[PDB]
Design a protein around this ligand. Sequence first.
Ligand SMILES: CCCCCCCCO[C@@H]1O[C@H](CO)[C@@H](O)[C@H](O)[C@H]1O
Ligand SMILES: CCCCCCCCO[C@@H]1O[C@H](CO)[C@@H](O)[C@H](O)[C@H]1O
Lengths: 107, 107
Amino acid sequence: QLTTESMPFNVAEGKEVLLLVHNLPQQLFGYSWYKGERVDGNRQIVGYAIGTQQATPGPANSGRETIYPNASLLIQNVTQNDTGFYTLQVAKSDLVNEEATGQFHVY
Amino acid sequence: QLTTESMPFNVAEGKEVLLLVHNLPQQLFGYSWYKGERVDGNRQIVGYAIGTQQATPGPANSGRETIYPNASLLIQNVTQNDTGFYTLQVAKSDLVNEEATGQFHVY
Ligand SMILES: CCCCCCCCO[C@@H]1O[C@H](CO)[C@@H](O)[C@H](O)[C@H]1O
Ligand SMILES: CCCCCCCCO[C@@H]1O[C@H](CO)[C@@H](O)[C@H](O)[C@H]1O
């Protein structure tokens, strides 16, 4: 149900990409974005909490990402390193969290 | 820092095992326990809120689990399908969460 997609799906090097997000839940505490295919705090880019509206970088944060209040993740001056899979956990207050994976390709 | 450890490490099928949890961070708002090596809501056993004490069964819930305020998980009438790996996510209120993976062996 929860999905993410990249606009565009194919991204020239050095140009922008937007990771969009769809079918969020009714009710969420916040979002966590991760590089690659699985939830892992060693590959966390950012945590975001809606109520205070508070982003915090994790270790995988490059400095070129911007998370928006609807979960969307912008990346500018994208690099070969950015290419491929991203992963998004929606955190809920009842601890039953939802997760999604998407990607884009760099050329 | 956050760790988990099985007691006992080897469990006779039909007996009990207790998953001890050490070094909870400060400023957390709940727990998730997942079956396996990875955080993944498809194999979740429970999400638990520490303020309200509500434990919510996930897909991987058997009925034999009991979860404590300090995050420890007891499992009773241990089957063979309970063997191996369990993974813990501590939900932090900055969403810069933490994870831990321990195991046990049935016989
Ligand atoms: C280039 C950066 C501009 C701002 C990025 C935020 C774009 C908004 O984001 C989009 O909004 C739509 C309606 O709210 C939703 O349907 C999409 O799923 C969502 O990701
Ligand atoms: C059947 C008994 C179940 C009661 C809950 C288990 C007791 C809580 O576990 C306690 O916390 C940590 C590991 O869990 C350690 O720091 C402590 O030694 C341990 O007593």
